[PDB]
Amino acid sequence: MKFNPFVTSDRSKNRKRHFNAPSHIRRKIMSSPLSKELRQKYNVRSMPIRKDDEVQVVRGHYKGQQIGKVVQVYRKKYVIYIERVQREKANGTTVHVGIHPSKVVITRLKLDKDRKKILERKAKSRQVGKEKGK
Amino acid sequence: SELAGHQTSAESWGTGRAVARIPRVRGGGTHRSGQGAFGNMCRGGRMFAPTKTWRRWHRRVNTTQKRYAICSALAASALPALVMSKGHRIEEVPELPLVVEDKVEGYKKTKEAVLLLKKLKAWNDIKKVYASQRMRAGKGKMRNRRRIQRRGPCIIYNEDNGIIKAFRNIPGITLLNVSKLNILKLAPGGHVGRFCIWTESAFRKLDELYGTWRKAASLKSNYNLPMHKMINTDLSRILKSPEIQRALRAPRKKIHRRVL
Amino acid sequence: APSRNGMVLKPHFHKDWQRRVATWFNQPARKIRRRKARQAKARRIAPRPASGPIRPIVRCPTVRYHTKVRAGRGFSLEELRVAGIHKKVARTIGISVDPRRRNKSTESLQANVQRLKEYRSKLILFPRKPSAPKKGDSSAEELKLATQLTGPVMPVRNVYKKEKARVITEEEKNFKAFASLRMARANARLFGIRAKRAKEAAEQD
RNA sequence: CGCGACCUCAGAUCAGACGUGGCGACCCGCUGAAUUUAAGCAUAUUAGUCAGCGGAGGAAAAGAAACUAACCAGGAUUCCCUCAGUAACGGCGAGUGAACAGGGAAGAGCCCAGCGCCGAAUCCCCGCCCCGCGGGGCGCGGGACAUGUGGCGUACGGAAGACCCGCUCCCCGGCGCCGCUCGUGGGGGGCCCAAGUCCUUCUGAUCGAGGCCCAGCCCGUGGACGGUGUGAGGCCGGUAGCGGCCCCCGGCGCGCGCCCGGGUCUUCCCGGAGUCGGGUUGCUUGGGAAUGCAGCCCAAAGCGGGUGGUAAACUCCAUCUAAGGCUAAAUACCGGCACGAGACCGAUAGUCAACAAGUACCGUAAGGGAAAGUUGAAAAGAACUUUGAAGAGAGAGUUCAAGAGGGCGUGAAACCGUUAAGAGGUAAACGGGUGGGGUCCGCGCAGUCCGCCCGGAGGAUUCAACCCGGCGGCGGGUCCGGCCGUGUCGGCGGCCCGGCGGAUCUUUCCCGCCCCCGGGGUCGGCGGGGGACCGUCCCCCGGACCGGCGACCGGCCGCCGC
RNA sequence: GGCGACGUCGGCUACCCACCCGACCCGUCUUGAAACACGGACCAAGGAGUCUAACACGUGCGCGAGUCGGGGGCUCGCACGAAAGCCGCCGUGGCGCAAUGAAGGUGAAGGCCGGCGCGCUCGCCGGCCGAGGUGGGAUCCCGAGGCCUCUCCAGUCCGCCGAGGGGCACCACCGGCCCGUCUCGCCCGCCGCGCCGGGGAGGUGGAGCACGAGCGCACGUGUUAGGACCCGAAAGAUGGU
RNA sequence: GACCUGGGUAUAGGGGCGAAAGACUAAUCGAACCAUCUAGUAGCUGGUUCCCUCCGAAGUUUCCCUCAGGAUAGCUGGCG
RNA sequence: GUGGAGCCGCCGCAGGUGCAGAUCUUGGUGGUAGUAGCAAAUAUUCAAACGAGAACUUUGAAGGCCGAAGUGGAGAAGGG
Ligand SMILES: [Mg+2]
Ligand SMILES: [Mg+2]
Ligand SMILES: [Mg+2]
Ligand SMILES: [Mg+2]
Ligand SMILES: [Mg+2]
Known part of the structure; x- marks a missing residue:
């Protein structure tokens, strides 16, 4: 239950933040949870998706066990594209059909100088909360 | 609509050309050329007696009635019929003033909350709250x-001492302090008899805080508990007593229907 | 438009009043605003008292209310002199001073002075460092509390007489009667004419 | 006749600063109508308000009495509650209409001219360096102000000066910081629990079902939003004196600058002028033989002057010191930046504007001023083939669905087209009445009664009766335990280790005092504390009566399943 | 008791048609409408007795000679909390308990017994009480007398009870009492003997008394003032192009 | 010819201007237009949205700058 | 039968709560009705081309009209 006065509860405004977001907020709302095998290795729950994180699609029309890497992340439409899932036009041309990334599981991440540091702090800021049980 | 609904400047035609004498807008040009201006009738117009912000919203009840109702709601949770038939499943529960010890207010983790209401056979009400989702x-x-x-x-x-921290997550349940009560919480929606779980330190303070009829209460401090208008309220035991039926006439049960 | 038996009415609505209306939809929101203006002022200053300084004892000035006693404004300025405290240390001791006030009776003088010499007796001050120029020991072993409420020395304490039980004596049950009020009115409005006929007595020579 | 001050005045694209416009909801000053009311209408009402004009602020204005009071005297302003719809005003009509008390929010008081004293002890500026930031100070020398009066002490509650007495020697700014900060000052970014597990439905799940003796999991985290439909657990986030960071926020402590107060007696000083008042005229106010304010004229005084609500004279009493000034708080806010919420409105509503709305458009101009939201989950927006110059069709295809086709959700009524059925000389439609026909509906089709009991006919199982065992329940009963009501009291039991209450009591009880001559007389008490009595509530034993919805014990009758 | 299927039996809807009888078109003003009186081509949606204050009365609830916290204050830094809870040496205050008068002012109890000063229509004293009386007045109480398988022996009872008593609310009257004036009249009291107070008996004026009934809240109705049930002018005024 | 005509300028609402008709002043004139006060007042016309059940009238008195209206009684209903 | 994501009963509470009319307001559509109308200033005709398609376009040949105060050649103002 919300107790803070300084944060909303309405439908009229949360949608209005949701469609009129900036872009740096927009990657934060486009995350996908980590897989079961990988949420023990890093013990962290969710990551902001990027261009190389390979993924199987679990809930939707194309369900499960189809590990394929992402190719393009429409932030404007809150939608990723994966180079395995496709749909042909009427022309016979192929185009990528798009899916909303909370219905998507990362099987393997990408690492750089940034993702070693983000996965530090996102894992660090969990077991501090475990130390409150004294 | 406070007053403005009249920011459209207009006048009546003022002659019997062939239209009604309603105010019509001025100018030309756009589709709002000679349309209907303000008046309750017209599109884009004002409303009939536009409501005011000073309608008498807030209401007074003098406090001798605010206390008469809070006594008559706590005294309706005592009876099992007035608290089952409100809708609370108190079938399997034990004694209707459910009273637990003062050690319950040390609870600060809600796993200790759920095993409380299960062991009192009162979880079968919260399970009914989940039907109302x-x-x-x-x-x-x-x-x-x-x-x-x-x-x-x-x-x-x-x-x-922590009991508000443990029950405020359980859906559809309430807490209230036994010094600062609420007729809104005790009798929700007018229908009397909300089911209640008490505490030793709360079930005892009411004798100081409302009293008995033998004394005035020491926390409402100038109060006396209401006086019962009836002595014996079980009139089935009254009218089957031989002091009454010593003086009755008779039954009279012949119908005497209409004779042709 | 007037009908059967009723009340003649003068409501003051002919003047346009729909602009000068003042809704009190914030009278809760000001009470929760001016408790914060006290709670962040009760702890903000000091263990100096809240609810202001020590206020005087003051009797109400009309025929209607001269039987009761009111908290006033300030010690008049000879109570500071009778109790022997300087007039411009009195408001930083924490006593409120009203400069323009008269006193013309000892029956209401001494109830301030007895209060004022008792206040400083029930007072402790703090040192800068405990050199203590005119202060004793540690103030009551850290003063037992911090702050009072709604008046330091309970400014009303309206006090009354007893006169427990008496015996009717002779005179007392005879004299002090209705005719002890009539001629008090019949003389004090005829005091001037009867002396005017006592001016005429001389010129008869 | 020249020269030199000083006074008046000018000049400068001189050196250095200011002001002008914007907004306007709130605030301050002016000016200021008419509709309306009075059933007409002039006074009055509308209202000293809308319009007009000028000013600033985050609030402003107001303000430390030329006050209210008329008694046991209150004591800045502002705001709220009453006083009050009262006193009063008014063709005494309609109507308008305060304040003082009283209760609360808030509470903060002061300076200057003058009078008199201090050898102008004062300020500005220019330049150099003391020496430091993001800059100014107290040095020093120049120049100007200024004696027509700068600075100190002073302000009407008095103040100075001369004593004399006993005290005491300070504060404040900056500087660097540590130690804090009540929601733990404020902002900013970045993170913090738990199911996609089995089956099932679907275009798609967030559906329905399920989870061992812990009730599958997390709960200080079941607000919310998006996700292919209804989500505590899929993701942002919510909860939390949760975390880690980055900057800024008030209050220890060395170097500076400032730096004798109080009481008593004695002398001395003591106040704002074309203003107050008075006359006359207008405006206004509840102010009524003039409340406020202004014009014009006559114009003050020192035991004076102002006020004390009926004009004038006298007398007495009260209260304040006007014609100079400053001031936070409580308070008003429909413009502004941000916000949060709504027993609201849901596209002809809500503001005029949910969209490229003060836009399209009109008017020479002041100005007037709309219409217009929705495909789907996804554009997957109809490739390809045929006909026609193209519009548009036919196939094919996409989609669960084009019966969603680029103003595309749902798609009404008027209305029109077409198919069918019907009938058609007094225009049609209508009410009452049956008859004909058609659609569908049931019973269902000379095939429908349904249960109860009994007697025959064959068929297959086992009570019941009693008796044992059995746990439970109903109804009585010595109420023996426990019980509770009401009156009788007692143990005063806890009163001096009881509850609340009492204008019941006590001048041999205990403090601060007056009355009377270093003391006392209770000599009358007063401000105050106990302890005595009642009035009601807490145990004991003792009494009554019902063992009552206040429940159990055993024993009895008569039920009940297994 | 009788009659009968694979197309029959019953049954109607906002169904069509045919027939008989009846039938002028609806809202409105009006004594009078079908009117040769006015508005109405059709259909969808919008579209008109509201709110605030004040009062009056009826009803409902709480308390009741009192009632009311509406304004402040208290509770931790709580979403639903702009809620709810409490204050009482927070009752200040409202309205009511006390009316009359222009105003100074004054401000509501008689009864029964006995004794008396010319018991003199005037009057003085103690006592018991205590809201006066008359006529109606639901109800309640006494109730002569009656009423049961045989006559004499008695019990709680019941029902019909003639008459009589106490008498609620109220209605009419008579009396009393408080205040304002008026006629007549004599007496008393002394913070000090006066163009001083107090009283009496008659007759009137009063929104009075005669054992009080009000306050708060909610709802309905009605009336007023507010744009006031919606719509409507010729105007008028300020300020501008 | 007291003639006709282009542009510049002047005069603005109780005011401009007029060889005079109350003409003309942006199709508007016996007082222009735009905005507000203002939703101005109306004893006057027009309208005033669901069903059943019960009761169910009035046009007269007196007075009014009253005669198209209101007050008062009459008549009606609801509550007792 | 369509429709594709929300809705209703019951006890109470609160209303911007119910339409045939107001020369109502906005919006829509008929009947009239394939009717009235496409009539001021004389006037067109033949062949060819481009073209899916010609009374209306272009090109020719002829017939004409405005007729130098123009139905011509050029500007101001305005139009942008
Ligand atoms: Mg629309
Ligand atoms: Mg259709
Ligand atoms: Mg008709
Ligand atoms: Mg005008
Ligand atoms: Mg709906």
């Missing part, structure tokens, strides 16, 4: 109140 009838869904939810019991306490 609907969504609102009508148009409340865009005035941001959505999930209709039946109230469950209340827990009535004093000297909060």
Whole structure:
């Protein structure tokens, strides 16, 4: 239950933040949870998706066990594209059909100088909360 | 609509050309050329007696009636019929003033909450609250109140030591302090007899805080508990007593229907 | 438009009043605003008292109310002199001073002075460092509390007489009667004419 | 006749600063109508308000009495509650209409001219360096102000000066910081629990079902939003004196600058002028033989002057010191930046404007001023083939669905087209009445009664009766335990280790005092504390009566399953 | 008791048609409408007795000679909390308990017994009480007398009870009492003997008394003032192009 | 010819201007237009949205700058 | 039968709560009706081309009209 006065509860405004977001907020709302095998290795729950994180699609029309890497992340439409899932036009041309990334599981991440540091702090800021049980 | 609805400047035609004498807008040009101006009748117009912000919203009830109703709601949770038939499943529960010890107010983790209400056979009410996870009838869904939810019991306490931290997550349940009560919480929606779980330190303070008829209460401090208008309220035991039926006439049960 | 038996009415609505209306939809929201203006002022200053300084003892000035006693404004300025405290240390001791006030009776003088010499007796001050120029020991072993409420020395304490039980004596049950009020009115409004006929007595020579 | 001050005045694209416009909801000053009311209408009402004009602020204005009071005297302003719809005003009509008390929010008081004293002890500026930031100070020398009066002490509650007595020697700014900060000052970014597990439905799940003796999991985290439909657990987030960071926020402590107060007696000083008042005229106010304010004229006084609500004279009493000034708080806010919420409105509503709305458009101009939201989950927006110059069709295809086809959700009524059925000389439609026909509906089709009991006919199982065992329940009963009501009291039991209450009591009880001559007389008490009595509530034993919805014990009758 | 299927039996809807009888078109003003009186081509949606204050009365609830916290204050830094809870040496205050008068002012109890000063229509004293009386007045109480398988022996009872008593609310009257004036009249009291107070008996004026009934809240109705049930002018005024 | 005509300028609402008709002043004139006060007042016309059940009238008195209206009684209903 | 995501009963509470009319307001559509109308200033005709398609376009040949105060050649103002 919300107790803070300084944060909303309405439908009229949360949608209005949701469609009129900036872009740096927009990657934060486009995350996908980590897989079961990988949420023990890093013990962290969710990551902001990027261009190389390979993924199987679990809930939707194309369900499960189809590990394929992402190719393009429409932030404007809150939608990723994966180079395995496709749909042909009427022309016979192929185009990528798009899916909303909370219905998507990362099987393997990408690492750089940034993702070693983000996965530090996102894992660090969990077991501090475990130390409150004294 | 406070006063403005009249920011459209217009006048009546003033002659019997062939239209009604309603005010018509000025100018030319756009589609709002000679249309209907203000008046309750017209499109884009003012409303009949536009409501005021000083309608008498807030209401007074003098406090001898505010206290008469809070006595008559706590004295309706005592009877099992007035608290089952409100809708609370108190079938399997033990004794209707459920009273637990003062050690319950040390609870600061809600796993200790759920095993409390299960062991008192009172969890079978919260399980009924989960049936009321609907969504609102009508148009409340865009005035941001959505999930209709039946109230469950209340827990009535004093000297909060953590009990509000343990029960405020359980859906559909309430707490209220036994010094600062609420007729809104005790008798929700007019129908009397909300189910309640008490505490030793709360079930004892009411004798100081409302009293008995033998003395005045020492916390409302100038109060006396209401006086019962009837002596014996079980009139089946009254009218089957031989002091009454010594003086009755008779029954008279012949119908004497209409004779042709 | 007037009908059967009723009340003649003068409502003051002919003047346009729909602009000068003042709704009190914030009279809760000001009470929760001016408790914060006290709670962040009760702890903000000091263990100096809240609810202001020590206020005087003052009797109400009309025929209607001269039987009761009111908290006033300030010690008049000879109570500071009788109790022997300087007039411009009195408001930083924490006593409120009203400069323009008269006193013309000892029956209401001494109830301030008895209060004022008792206040400083029930007072402790703090040193800068405990050199203590005119202060004793540690103030009551850290003063037992911090702050009072709604008046330091309970400014009303309206006190009354007893006169427990008496015996009717002779005179007392005879004299002090209705005719002890009539001629008090019949003389004090005829005091001037009867002396005017006592001016005429001389010129008869 | 020249020269030199000083006074008046000018000049400068001189050196250095200011002001002008914007907004206007709130605030301050002016000016200021008419509709309306009075059933007409002039006074009055509308209202000293809308319009007009000028000013600033985050609030402003107001303000430390030329006050209210008329008694046991209150004591800045502002705001709220009453006083009050009262006193009063008014063709005494309609109507308008305060304040003082009283209760609360808030509470903060002061300076200057003058009078008199201090050898102008004062300020500005220019330049150099003391020496430091993001800059100014107290040095020093120049120049100007200024004696027509700068600075100190002073302000009407008095103040100075001369004593004399006993005290005491300070504060404040900056500087660097540590130690804090009540929601733990404020902002900013970045993170913090738990199911996609089995089956099932679907275009798609967030559906329905399920989870061992812990009730599958997390709960200080079941607000909310998006996700292919209804989500505590899929993701942002919510909860939390949760976390880690980055900057800024008030209050220890060395170097500076400032730096004798109080009481008593004695002398001395003591106040704002074309203003107050008075006359006359207008405006206004509840102010009524003039409340306020202004014009014009006559114009003050020192035991004076102002006020004390009926004009004038006398007398007495009260209260304040006007014609100079400053001031936070409580308070008003429909413009502004941000916000949060709504027993609201849901696209002809809500503001005029949910969209490229003060836009399209009109008017020479002041100005007037709309219409217009929705495909789907996804554009997957109809490739390809045929006909026609193209519009548009036919196939094919996409989609669960084009019966969603680029103003595309749902798609009404008027209305029109077409198919069918019907009938058609007094225009049609209508009410009452049956008859004909058609659609569909049931019973269902000379095939429908349904249960109860009994007697025959064959068929297959086992009570019941009693008796044992059995746990439970109903109704009585010595109420023996426990019980509770009401009156009788007692143990005063806890009163001096009881509850609340009492204008019941006590001048041999205990403090601060007056009355009377270093003391006392209770000599009358007063401000105050106990302890005595009642009035009601707490145990004991003792009494009554019902063992009552206040429940159990055993024993009895008569039920009940297994 | 009788009659009968694979197309029959019953049954109607906002169904069509045919027939008989009846039938002028609806809202409105009006004594009078079908009117040769006015508005109405059709259909969808919008579209008109509201709110605030004040009062009056009826009803409902709480308390009741009192009632009312509406304004402040208290509770932790709580979403639902702009809620709810409490204050009482927070009752200040409202309205009511006390009316009359222009105003100074004054401000509501008689009864029964006995004894008396010319018991003199005037009057003085103690006592018991205590809201006066008359006529109606639901109800309640006494109730002569009656009423049961045989006559004499008695019990709680019941029912019909003639008459009589106490008498609620109220209605009419008579009396009393408080205040304002008026006629007549004599007496008393002394913070000090006066163009001083107090009283009496008659007759009137009063929104009075005669054992009080009000306050708060909610609802309905009605009336007023507010744009006031919606719509409507010729105007008028300020300020501008 | 007291003639006709282009542009510049002047005069603005109780005011401009007029060889005079109350003409003309942006199709508007016996007082222009735009905005507000203002939703101005109306004893006057027009309208005033669901069903059943019960009761169910009035046009007269007196007075009014009253005669198209209101007050008062009459008549009606609801509550007792 | 369509429709594709929300809705209703019951006890109470609160209303911007119910339409045939107001020369109502906005919007829509008929009947009239394939009717009235496409009539001021004389006037067109033949062949060819481009073209899916010609009374209306272009090109020719002829017939004409405005007729130098123009139905011509050029500007101001305005139009942008
Ligand atoms: Mg709906
Ligand atoms: Mg629309
Ligand atoms: Mg159709
Ligand atoms: Mg008709
Ligand atoms: Mg005008």
